[PDB]
């Protein structure tokens, strides 16, 4: 169901390549008709409310999409309810035979496993979670317990659930003994890496995404090119230049992606320009990547332009350590930067102490400040120490 959530997000807000909305709208209409989900055709009305590039034309004539009618009707709804009532009749016929038999704990749990898949495919969220809790306690081992988490993670990625899904994610991880189990490792590192995306941890995102076991590729939730897509974005923050030439540029998993998928280009244009520290080539590849990567992805476009500010902060630090004193017009004719607009670009960092760059407005030259010292490092202990003493006084006076 990767293309189900992808094409549904493309119809929310798209400021670039409006032609992709046609292939996205025509896909979600043919996918719901071929599936059993009733409400996901109705959710298109509420989910797109107050969004640029509206996909719904009823009272709003400002819709810029190519397919302007997502409107819900009773014609398709009644047809989807017939497939739901016909399938539950076959399952209840088998469950009734299982209740009268009751052979082991696997067949008793399999009755709820078939329901856990049924209630997930008919569009129920809380009703499906109630069915998954019954099969979790009746499981004979950890093999049937992790399949419960797979359905929880399926409904959690569509509705963006950071609480119930994250709690059950670490529950299967801990249990009694973890071990080297492939299911409790490969699946955990990929799903927990997706949860780190939305919260932007960046500490475990580089290790659990840029470094993957082999291909992942379950095809049910996320795909192969998606894991490599976030790897290029998250690999530019925590991973320094030492790991860029090992797990990024020289990574064997990213060598065959260039000749396979050419629509990404985030592992070449961004990596080569940063490794060579050339601002001339690095600038035009920012908007080309921003359009075809950040915007289409669901966990990226929520932030978007903030990443442009953070990615440009990386290249400013690469040049700052390469010189002490430099003229402003030198990088203008070489790296293709505007002198008049350079002060406004660097004005979002230097006063916030994000960069050590110092530009002299008299002669038009840039200098370099001290990158690190003992004084700037003790300031982190001041804010961390004062913030810790608050809990000691708060919890100390609360208990009495």
């Amino acid at each position: 169901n990767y293309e189900v959530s992808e094409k549904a997000f493309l119809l929310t807000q798209s400021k670039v390549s409006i032609e992709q909305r046609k292939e996205a709208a025509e896909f979600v209409l043919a996918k719901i008709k071929e599936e059993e989900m009733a409400p996901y055709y109705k959710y298109l009305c509420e989910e797109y409310l107050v969004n640029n590039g509206q996909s719904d034309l009823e009272h709003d004539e400002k819709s810029d999409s190519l397919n302007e009618w997502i409107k819900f009707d009773q014609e398709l709804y009644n047809e989807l309810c017939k497939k739901n009532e016909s399938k539950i009749k076959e399952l209840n016929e088998k469950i009734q035979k299982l209740e009268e038999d009751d052979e082991g704990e696997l067949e008793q749990a399999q009755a709820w496993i078939n329901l856990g898949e049924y209630y997930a495919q008919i569009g129920d969220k809380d009703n499906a979670e109630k069915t998954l809790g019954k099969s979790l306690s009746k499981a004979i081992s950890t093999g049937a317990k992790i399949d419960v988490m797979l359905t929880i993670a399926r409904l959690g990625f569509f509705y963006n659930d950071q609480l119930y899904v994250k709690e059950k994610l670490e529950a299967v991880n801990s249990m009694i003994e973890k071990g080297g189990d492939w299911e409790r490792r490969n699946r955990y590192k990929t799903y927990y890496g997706i949860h780190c995306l939305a919260v932007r941890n960046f500490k475990e995102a580089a290790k659990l995404l840029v470094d993957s076991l082999a291909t992942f590729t379950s095809i049910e939730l996320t795909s192969y090119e998606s894991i490599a897509t976030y790897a290029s974005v998250t690999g530019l923050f925590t991973l320094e230049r030492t790991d860029l030439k090992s797990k990024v540029i020289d990574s064997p998993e990213l060598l065959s992606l260039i000749s396979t998928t050419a629509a990404l280009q985030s592992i070449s244009s961004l990596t080569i320009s940063l490794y060579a520290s050339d601002y001339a080539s690095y600038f035009p590849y920012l908007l080309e990547t921003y359009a075809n990567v950040l915007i289409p992805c669901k966990y990226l476009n929520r932030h978007a332009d903030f990443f442009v500010r953070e990615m440009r902060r990386k290249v400013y630090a690469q040049l700052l350590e390469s010189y002490k004193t430099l003229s402003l017009k030198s990088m203008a004719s070489a790296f293709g930067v505007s002198v008049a607009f350079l002060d406004n670009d660097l004005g979002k960092f230097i006063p916030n102490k994000q960069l050590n760059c110092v530009i002299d407005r008299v002669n038009g030259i840039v200098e370099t400040n001290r990158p690190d010292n003992k004084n700037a490092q003790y300031h982190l202990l001041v804010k961390q120490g004062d913030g810790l003493l608050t809990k000691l006084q708060k919890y100390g006076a609360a208990v009495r």
Binding site: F283, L286, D305, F306, R309, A332, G336, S338, N344
Partner: peptide, 27 residues
């Protein structure tokens, strides 16, 4: 999140391509 994590800039978005244009023209 707050500060520039949300508001960010909201300026010079589509004008980045104009910087390369003015460099290849006025040259």
């Amino acid at each position: 999140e707050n500060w520039d994590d949300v508001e960010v800039d909201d300026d010079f978005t589509n004008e980045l391509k104009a910087e390369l244009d003015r460099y290849k023209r006025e040259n």
